[PDB]
RNA sequence: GUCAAGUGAAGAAGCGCAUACGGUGGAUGCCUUGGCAGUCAGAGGCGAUGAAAGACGUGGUAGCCUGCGAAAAGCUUCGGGGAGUCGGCAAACAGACUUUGAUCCGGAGAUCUCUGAAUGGGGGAACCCACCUAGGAUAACCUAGGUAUCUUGUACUGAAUCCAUAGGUGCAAGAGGCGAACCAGGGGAACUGAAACAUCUAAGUACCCUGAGGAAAAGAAAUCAACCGAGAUUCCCUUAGUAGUGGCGAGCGAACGGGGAUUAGCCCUUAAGCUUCAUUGAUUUUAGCGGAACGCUCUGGAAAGUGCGGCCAUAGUGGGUGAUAGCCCCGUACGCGAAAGGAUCUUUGAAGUGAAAUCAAGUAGGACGGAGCACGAGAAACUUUGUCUGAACAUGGGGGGACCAUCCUCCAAGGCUAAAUACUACUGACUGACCGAUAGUGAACCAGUACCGUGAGGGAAAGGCGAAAAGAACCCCGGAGAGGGGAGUGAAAUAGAACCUGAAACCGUAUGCGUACAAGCAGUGGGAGCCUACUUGUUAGGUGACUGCGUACCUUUUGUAUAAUGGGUCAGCGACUUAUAUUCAGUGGCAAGCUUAACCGUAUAGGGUAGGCGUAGCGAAAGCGAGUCUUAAUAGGGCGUU
RNA sequence: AACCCACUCCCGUUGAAAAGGUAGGGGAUGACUUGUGGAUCGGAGUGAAAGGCUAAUCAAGCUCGGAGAUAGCUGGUUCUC
RNA sequence: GGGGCUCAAACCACACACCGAAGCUGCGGGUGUCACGUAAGUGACGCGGUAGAGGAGCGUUCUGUAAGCCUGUGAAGGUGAGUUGAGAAGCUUGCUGGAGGUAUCAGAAGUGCGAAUGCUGACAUGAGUAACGACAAUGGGUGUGAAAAACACCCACGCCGAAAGACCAAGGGUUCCUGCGCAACGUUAAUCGACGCAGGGUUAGUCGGUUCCUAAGGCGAGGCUGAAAAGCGUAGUCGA
RNA sequence: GAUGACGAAGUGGUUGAUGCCAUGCUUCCAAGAAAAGCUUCUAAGCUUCAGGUAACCAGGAACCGUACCCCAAACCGACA
RNA sequence: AUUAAAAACACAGCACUCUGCAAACACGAAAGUGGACGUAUAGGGUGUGACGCCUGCCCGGUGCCGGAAGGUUAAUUGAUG
RNA sequence: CCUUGUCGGGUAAGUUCCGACCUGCACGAAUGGCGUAACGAUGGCGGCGCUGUCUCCACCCGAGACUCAGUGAAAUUGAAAUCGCUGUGAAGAUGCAGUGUAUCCGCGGCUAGACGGAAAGACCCCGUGAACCUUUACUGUAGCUUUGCACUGGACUUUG
RNA sequence: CUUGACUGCGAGACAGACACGUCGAGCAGGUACGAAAGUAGGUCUUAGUGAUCCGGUGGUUCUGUAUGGAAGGGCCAUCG
């Protein structure tokens, strides 16, 4: 039972080279470089499913900071005043109301100033 | 064949290190754990053989796969005669186990495509499980009780 | 309209990514005229009647293979075959041969150049020069025989030296050389292991040498056993990794006793046996002959495949035939078959041999020095002998592991013997959970070639059109090119000869988008824009401006982005196997038992329980035993006991 | 001068050349140079001696075997959870 | 760390708020173990990992299953797309291909490659870069040709001339000559060639060899010697 | 330009070798191949025809190598 | 040979020592052969190195040469216990 | 060795050279001691000539370089979208941090870096590695030599 | 005064990878001293040492290659 391994080696290399397509030069077309680029892309993608949740939070916080300062309040005073009250409303929909629904965000910052924090 | 000399000297050549042309890494070279003619015949105990037999005659009974006849004898060495004798029984793809194989019964069905004629000593677990029905004579059932217990 | 300030879309020398077509390249798949390994048989040699191995010739075209040998791809006969043929790469073409029977196949002959043991003498293999006899030939030769050395036998001859010895001449017979292994001998390592290394091991191995045969060798008790017995030798399984042996280290390793395969002993008051002949029948082999049973239909280039209905079978899983065939062909099961050779067995004569003469003397034994016996000379028996010695004579003699008595058992110093056993370069058949072109032989192909070496010696790469050459008439560009564009053939030519499929690396052309103020493992998270398909949206594909994070992989290390190692890349290949002993787990069968090994077997069955392990242990042992050992101890203690 | 040699520089070092070229240099009737044939060979030759040379190989040639020597060393060891 | 900071954006206190991790919590999945459960069935604690132990799988080739099933209404292979699984991977399909393939469950392994200065082929990069082999030396004309720096001829220029000339031995083995050619070889082109195809050419009493003779040395009947193989040698007979 | 016929002068002096006489001559030590062909002598034998020696006549001299390269592109250096 | 040409090696000359011929010595399990068809003015080994002047002291170690014959001492003998 | 010892000469200046001295680390008489004409592709010092050796290079002549046409290598190479500085860090960074500079791509040059390329460091270490040389290492052996016993005898004499 | 620097052991611990090592009540047999309880298995304590294999010596109940013995081996004590 001699078994000739050239038909499975090819499909495994096609799988790696298909995962590597779009990359520069030998990163997309030779196996020993495409393999490393695919593994590295996988590590970065694991890391960046975490940093996505880190980076969007900071953007929300920066937009809420900018929207609250137009109404005469900090970010931090706003988050404190929204817990002297009870809003349970997150950084995502507050940033969305900061850009889009500005009168509702003004109502929210006035109910935070109403709790005097 | 060949492969006595070192191919090159070991230093200076700037090349990887070889001691023969016929190394198994090389394409002329040998295979690393090259086979030699071995045996695959293993030991089955006598009791384990006889007890594996006694439990496939039991399944040939339960699955309605075993067929007992009083005697099974053909007249002439003709395959057409034995086809006609099996077609009365409604019987294709059969292992015929007689007590001793007659030469008429052997000359017929040694051409026939799905029929095998064996004796009781000459039956085996693979041919009992393989053929879709198993025809035995009464003398074969006597002989199986003598052998198997 | 003007002037300021702001803002910025196209415009790519070239690149990047994606896509689509190509090119290179030969992977992959599929295939096989080649290998590899067994089983069952064969016959086990060929050679002075000139071998194995060659050189040169030999053909209508003539290079190389393959045959042949100046009678040269053949000649003569017998026998078979019954329609084509003049071997292959190599298809065509000439001149022809064949039913008055070619070609082809087997048996027997004839010829058989030169080399090579090479043998008339030389020699640098395939060349050079001879002699004698017989016959034929007109100052030139030609035919057919001889002409080596050695050994043995014989005849003639005869030196010193008288006799006869050496020697010499002639006859007869035989030898020599080659071959993969097997066998019996002569001579015999070292690496290695011992974790160094000397004894030892490896190992009486490898190698070199000499003989013989189809087998050889050995073999008919001066053999073992314990007072019972067995009876030649060889081979296998055990006893047993046991007793021994060993720097008592590494290791090396029996025997008794069993189980078998095999079957015989004849003689030195002359035998079995084996040869060679002549016969007596018989069997095989070298070639062949016959050898059953299928039609219609669909798809298709083509049917063996589809659908339906049959038939044959001592023949059904063979090969190939335009796709997969028991019924189309060659075959297969099954019967038949030989002018002539060969081989085995059998009669019944014959000549030989065995065969050394007459039961064993420079022999047994011994002293030194070795070697072997599993046994490193050791308490060292037994065997063999290089040196030196040296017996008895059946009221002898040697063996029973130092040695001595007593018993038991054999008769050495002369021989010959079949089978079981080993091996396979060589044939034939069959087989494979063997390979399928980097594999399998080094070698599927014009391979031990090409090539490399002064040589010994080393040693490649290279398979596939199509079912059939139907291998592309003709036209056009081009150099009466190369290569193409058509046309034809074909089912298919992006099957067009470098020809099945035709991957990846690598190189292009086309389209989309992004790229010329931007700094780094080239991605990843976010993300605008643009472009295509859709059909539109909270989509799919392609680019990815801009932006956060971000120093490859391996290996080694305490630690590597490391300026440590390793890798140019791709595609193939490339590393825990196998055998035998054993231990543990899991899983089965039998169970106080289980299990067989060789071997027998109409053969994976069944038989064969010799042997192995278990049912009892203790002790160094004798021994004793549910106990035993130690001990003065019925005490203690160690080990053991539903 | 031929011939034989090889002291110096420079070039060349992937060479025209695996040891050369060009300029200069030494011997050049002899312990000279050379053709052709022959002899000596691997613990063995030959050596006006250097471990020189023995087929571009030399403190023990080449080749084939023992042989897949041995390596407490280095390198490598292939799919998944 | 930089910009920059001086009733601070530095320091010493104190206060309140905020950001900040793969930590915790929420929400949705998968898995291990343990306990419960007529086995749906939940709970609870877990779940970084090198050497290493243990457990469970995928895929490749072969054999049985298989005289089965699939397949020329198109196999294997190749190349895309979609899709499904924790993964190895699976499944469906467009094109290519043009004859084979192997559900399932078992048996067996030449069973999985990126590294070994790994083997062997193809192909890159360096790069259209260095070179193109003595610095005797070339310039026109004419022809032939598809095309001439290079071929041939003419004119002229150089160079060797104790050779760059004529010849013999060795070694080579047809390279010689003539027709036809230019793919490859020629470090460029080639109409030329020591290249390809096909023909032809080598004439001896006197030149060389054989033949005659011997040197070194070889071999050597017999012979001496040596475990064998063989060594040495007499007669001899090769050897320029 | 290829070929057939015809075809002038073709003599004298000097210098001359590393060639020849010369395997000579002189000299010196380092003291300078073998064997055959050749000349000659007999032996063993012949019958002393054969054999030898001259003359003359007729006839013969086998086989093999010869092309081409050798201060080389053809040999030895993997190469023009 | 291919990084060292020299002061290195060689050399004439010198001295020591061996060798009486079947030589010492060398290659050869041996036969044989070289030395040498030579013969002590010859032949081997060793050291020194033309020439000129010279070549001093030491015989304890070690070697080599000779010497008595006392101790020791091997195989082999094989008394005695 | 100290050491470039001291003194003389040579030079403007002399660790070298020549002549002495003798405190010879550590000369010394055939592993010869001292001299020595001639002879060295021999070592070291000084001089005359001579000059691109030099100050200090200028110009010229050919052959490459450069461009054009034809042919067409190499070592190396994990992939590259391949800056400077200051730090940091397996401790000397194009790739890390901070920060400056910097439109995109050649060609000719030059070599400061890529711990550049070439050779599994030669030095050093290590291996219960190897090889070969030495000897008064250990163990042996060829050869040489002593005696016994054979081959090997008789005859006398001295003698236990 | 005298041999307890005893013989057979040895519950149990300490130490400890192993080989080794350390302490030891008690029991039996025999003894010292002491009138007797009792002390005594060396020394106030911890160093003063060396495995195995070979050999030597003295015992022995064991073995003892056909048997009776020996040889050699085994166990026990001891030496190099």
TrEMBL record, chain A:
Molecular function GO labels: rRNA binding; structural constituent of ribosome
One term under GO cellular component: ribonucleoprotein complex
NCBIfam families hit by this protein: rplT_bact (TIGR01032)
Stored PROSITE patterns: RIBOSOMAL_L20 (PS00937)
Record lineage: Bacteria, Pseudomonadati, Pseudomonadota, Gammaproteobacteria, Pseudomonadales
InterPro entries assigned to the protein according to its UniProt record, in alphabetical order: Ribosomal_bL20, RIBOSOMAL_L20_CS, Ribosomal_protein_bL20_C
GO BP annotations listed: ribosomal large subunit assembly; translation
Assigned keywords, A-Z: Ribonucleoprotein, Ribosomal protein, RNA-binding, rRNA-binding
Keyword presence, Amino-acid biosynthesis: no
Protein name stated in the entry: Large ribosomal subunit protein bL20
Role summary: Binds directly to 23S ribosomal RNA and is necessary for the in vitro assembly process of the 50S ribosomal subunit. It is not involved in the protein synthesizing functions of that subunit.
TrEMBL record, chain B:
Domain of life per record: Bacteria
Molecular function GO terms recorded: rRNA binding; structural constituent of ribosome
Keyword line: Ribonucleoprotein, Ribosomal protein, RNA-binding, rRNA-binding
Any GO BP annotation: translation
Keyword RNA-binding set for record: yes
Membrane-spanning intervals of the chain: none
One of the record's GO cellular component terms: ribonucleoprotein complex
Keyword flag Methyltransferase: no
Subunit structure comment from the entry: Part of the 50S ribosomal subunit.
Family label: Belongs to the universal ribosomal protein uL4 family.
Role according to the record: Forms part of the polypeptide exit tunnel. One of the primary rRNA binding proteins, this protein initially binds near the 5'-end of the 23S rRNA. It is important during the early stages of 50S assembly. It makes multiple contacts with different domains of the 23S rRNA in the assembled 50S subunit and ribosome.
Protein name listed in UniProt: Large ribosomal subunit protein uL4
Protein's organism: Pseudomonas aeruginosa
Positions spanned in the full protein: 52 to 200 of 200
């Amino acid at each position: 039972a001699r078994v000739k391994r050239g038909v499975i080696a090819r499909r495994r290399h096609k799988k790696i080279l298909k995962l590597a397509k779009g990359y520069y030069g030998a990163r997309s077309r030779v196996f020993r470089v495409a393999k490393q680029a695919v593994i590295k892309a996988g590590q970065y993608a694991y890391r960046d499913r975490r940093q996505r949740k880190r980076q969007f939070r900071a953007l929300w916080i920066a937009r809420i900071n900018a929207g609250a300062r137009q109404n005469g309040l900090s970010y931090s005073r706003l988050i404190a005043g929204l817990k002297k009250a009870a809003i349970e409303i997150d950084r995502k929909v507050l940033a969305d109301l900061a850009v889009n629904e500005k009168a509702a965000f003004t109502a929210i910052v006035e109910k935070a100033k109403a709790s005097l924090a | 064949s060949g492969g006595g000399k070192k191919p090159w000297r070991q230093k200076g050549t700037g090349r990887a290190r070889a001691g023969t042309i016929r190394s198994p890494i090389w394409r002329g070279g040998g295979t690393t754990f090259a086979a030699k003619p071995r045996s695959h015949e293993q030991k089955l105990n006598k009791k384990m053989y006889r007890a594996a037999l006694r439990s496939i005659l039991a399944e040939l009974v339960r699955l309605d796969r075993l067929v007992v006849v009083a005697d099974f004898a053909v007249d002439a060495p003709k395959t057409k005669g034995l086809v006609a004798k099996l077609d009365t029984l409604g019987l294709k793809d059969v292992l015929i186990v007689t007590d001793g194989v007659d030469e008429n019964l052997y000359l017929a069905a040694r051409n026939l495509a799905h029929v095998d004629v064996r004796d009781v000593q000459g039956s085996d677990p693979v041919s009992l499980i393989a053929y879709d029905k198993v025809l035995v004579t009464v003398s074969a059932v006597k002989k199986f009780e003598e052998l198997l217990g």
